Structures are given as C-alpha cells and as structure tokens.
Design a protein around this ligand. Structure first.
Ligand code: R24
Ligand code: BOG
Length: 339
C-alpha cells in the first residue's frame, strides 16, 4: 500500500517524504525546485530528492512539471539520469499539489574534475565517449538538451558519466551554438554537438574554449577560431541586412585546429574539427561521432542503444492547469520503479 510519510521544514520549505528516505539535507535551491541529499533505507543508496516549486501555480509551471516527469520516466540509459522514484503526499487528485523526484545522488559534476586535475587522453576519450553515448540515446527520442555544459554532467569516482539538468533557477553562453544566440527560430539537435565540441576542447586544454562576456563577444570569439561564414553558409541566410552586416565585418579565416590544440591526440583534433562547424548541417552527429577512430577503445555498435518511442505530442497542446495536474497525477500513479 501507500508508504508512511513524515514532515519537516528545511529552509522555510515543507518536505513531506516517505519514511524510507532519511538524513535529508539541502544541496540546492531555486525558482524551479529544491534538492536534498538523503539515504534510501530500502536500497542502501544515497539519493537526490527534488521537490518541484509551485508545480501547478501557473500554466507554464504545470506544463514543466508534466514535461519533467514524462521525460524522466522515459530515460533508461546508463549515461543519462534515471528516475528511482516519484511520489506525492496527496492521497487523491483533489489533494495533489506537490511532486518529488528521486534519482541517484550525484555530488560531483564534470566542472569539478576539470578544475582539479589535468586529464589524460584516455580520460578525455572515456568522458567524451559517454557524453556522446547518452546524447545518441537522448537524440533518438527527438529530445534536444539545449543546455549541455560541464555543470550538467555528473561524474562519479569511477569516471562514469550521466547527462542531466542540475539547474534550479560556468556561463551557459560559453557552450551555446552560434545559431541559438542568433535567435535562429527553428534550430535542431546539432546544437548539442556544438556544446560537446566546446566541452571536449576544454577537457583537452583545461580552459574554457570561448569564454565570451556577452552574446556579441561570444560570437567574435567563435569566429576567431572557425572563421566568418563562407559563401555556402551565407546562402542559408535569406536576410540581406544580416548578410551585408556579416560581409562588412573584418573577415576572419578559419584556423587549422591542429595548429590550435597543441599536443592533443590528432584523432581528438580531427573529431573537434567535425563538431565545431558553424553550419550545423555539417556537424558530425552523436551516432557518427561514436564510430570515429578517437573512440576505438570504447566504441561498440552493439552497446550504444536508442530510446523507445517517446510520445511528445503534449508539447503542442494548450491545456488547463488542472488538466496538466491530472495528467501528471496519472504519471505519478503509473510509475514503476527500476529493479
Ligand atoms: C522542465 C524540465 C524538463 C526536463 C528536465 N530535465 N531534462 C533532463 C534531460 C533528460 C534532458 C537530461 C533532465 C532533467 N531534469 C533533471 O535532471 N532533474 C533532476 C531530477 C532530480 C534531481 C536532480 N538533481 C540532482 C540529481 C542528483 N544529484 C544531485 C546533487 C546535487 C544537486 N544539487 O545540489 O542541486 C542536484 C542533484 C535533477 C529539467 C527541467
Ligand atoms: C555570425 C556568424 C554566423 C553563424 C551562423 C550559424 C549557422 C547555423 O547553421 C544553420 O542552423 C540552422 C538552424 O538549425 C539550419 O536550419 C541551417 O541549415 C544551418 O546552416
């Protein structure tokens, strides 16, 4: 039946969780939610418990809540966050006002690793391999992460990496594809490969590749490496004023990456070239990057799985808060823990 719950206040926040979850201490807080570390007595594992903030107080919050539960319930991959539990104190839908999501506790992110050691090439290989493996899986479900950066990549003592979203309220713009910042209205998956490129570069050199101070600086820093748009790419911009603006800048040539990333594995350099192309249609995909000779030690085409079909049709619906709430509630109730 239903577990026995208990109540406590942590930081002017009520946490009402099943008894199984003990030793709650706050680790993160913000507009989106708050998180406590906890011990799961049933399994012996340390867990993160995320309580959504105001999950049904607005239409946008209500859809986000549903969006996040659905996505997390779907992700079943070693290199992506998985859901251990989801629960509510509510005994009925008419009572339903709070949602808590439980996953493995992940205390260290890739950002921590990159500050605190200079990585071997085998170390870069393993980490980048695992990011592309999770992304291949995420991209197969027609999900775009949009915010890949070191602080959204958990890494454990054993160097095993999981993609998630740690955010609850390392500038995002440093890792962002040039078209996101251009407000290109219809961008795609390949934006995530730009980010992987930036993270891989930083793993090789130990420093941010493009530490822009704003969006304009960001773009300048990008063009110094990859060059001003060519003829073919200028064609894919139908705006004349954009083209004339770009043509009126000091033209930057493309740098040879092998000349920039000095002393990196030539294979890593070649892979980087394929990731950090301005024209997103030319970027290497996650599935393709996995088969690149840089990962010969890791690649197994038979252990790089794709997602089950993911029904995302809700994204295009405009619904009432209590419709989003009832749907979220169906998802809480139907949840089956992993073994
Ligand atoms: C509205 C929305 C929709 C989806 C997501 N989302 N998306 C994804 C992808 C599948 C694409 C990677 C993942 C997420 N959400 C997500 O990761 N949520 C999510 C769910 C439970 C716990 C957490 N945080 C944490 C997990 C594990 N150790 C942690 C340790 C510390 C902290 N800390 O100090 O703040 C947070 C932790 C994140 C996030 C927000
Ligand atoms: C100021 C420097 C110019 C940067 C140009 C970025 C080119 C982005 O690449 C573009 O992304 C679009 C969005 O998916 C695609 O539809 C286009 O096919 C692709 O060329």
């Amino acid at each position: 039946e239903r577990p026995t719950f208990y109540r406590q206040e942590l930081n002017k926040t009520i946490w009402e969780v099943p008894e199984r979850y003990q030793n709650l201490s706050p680790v993160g807080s913000g507009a989106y939610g708050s998180v406590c570390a906890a011990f799961d007595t049933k399994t012996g594992l340390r867990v993160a418990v995320k309580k959504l903030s105001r999950p049904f107080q607005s239409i946008i919050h209500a859809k986000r809540t549903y969006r996040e539960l659905r996505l997390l319930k779907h992700m079943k991959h070693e290199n992506v966050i998985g859901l251990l539990d989801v629960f509510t104190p509510a005994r009925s839908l008419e009572e339903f006002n709070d949602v808590y999501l439980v996953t493995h506790l992940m205390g260290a992110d890739l950002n921590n690793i990159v500050k605190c050691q200079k990585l071997t090439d085998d170390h870069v290989q393993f980490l980048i391999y695992q990011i592309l493996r999770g992304l291949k899986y995420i991209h197969s479900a027609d999900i775009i992460h949009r915010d890949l950066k070191p602080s959204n990549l958990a890494v454990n003592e054993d160097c095993e990496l999981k993609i998630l979203d740690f955010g609850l309220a390392v500038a995002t713009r440093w890792y962002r594809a040039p078209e996101i910042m251009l407000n290109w209205m219809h961008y795609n998956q390949t934006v995530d490969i730009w980010s992987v490129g930036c993270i891989m570069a930083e793993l090789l050199t130990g420093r941010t590749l493009f530490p822009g101070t704003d969006h304009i600086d960001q773009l300048k820093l990008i063009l110094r490496l990859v060059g001003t748009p060519g003829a073919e790419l200028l064609k894919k911009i139908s705006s004349e004023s954009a083209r004339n603006y770009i043509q009126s800048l000091t033209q930057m040539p493309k740098m040879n990456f092998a000349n920039v990333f000095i002393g990196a594995n030539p294979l890593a350099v070649d892979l980087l070239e394929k990731m950090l192309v301005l024209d997103s249609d030319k970027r290497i995909t996650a599935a393709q990057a996995l088969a690149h000779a840089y990962f010969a030690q890791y690649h197994d085409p038979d252990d790089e799985p794709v997602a089950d079909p993911y029904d995302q049709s809700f994204e295009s619906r405009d619904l009432l808060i209590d419709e989003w709430k009832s749907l979220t509630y169906d998802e809480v109730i139907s949840f089956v823990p992993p073994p």
